[PDB]
Amino acid sequence: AVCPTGLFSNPLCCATNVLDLIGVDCKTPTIAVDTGAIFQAHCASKGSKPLCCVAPVADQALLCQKAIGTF
Numbered sequence: 392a393v394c395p396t397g398l399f400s401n402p403l404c405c406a407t408n409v410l411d412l413i414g415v416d417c418k419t420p421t422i423a424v425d426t427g428a429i430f431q432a433h434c435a436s437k438g439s440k441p442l443c444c445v446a447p448v449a450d451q452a453l454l455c456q457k458a459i460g461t462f
Contacts, residue, residue, distance in 0.1 A: 393426065393443070395459070398445055398454075399443040399454075399455070399456045401445065401447040402424050402441065402442075402443060403418065403419060403420070403444050403447075403453075404417065404434035404437050405434075405444075405453075405455065408440070408442055408455050408457060411456075412456075413452065413454065413455065414442045414444050414454075416449075416451075417453055417455070419448070421433070427441070427458060430458055440457075440462065441458035441461050442455040442457060442458060443457075443459075444456070
């Protein structure tokens with residue numbers, strides 16, 4: 392899995408991870424992301440970055456972590 396199970400188990404495409412903890416303008420992937428490369432390429436197509444967050448729904452705010460092996 393691209394995201395660790397538990398707290399940061401939700402893969403989201405976000406503009407940036409403020410202070411490396413707060414995903415901004417996060418959006419749920421529109422295709423299955425089964426590998427880090429696909430995850431990253433898909434988000435990139437949205438001008439975003441692959442982040443693993445606490446919730447599968449982006450309401451703004453939102454605690455996130457960088458997807459392992461990206462950037």
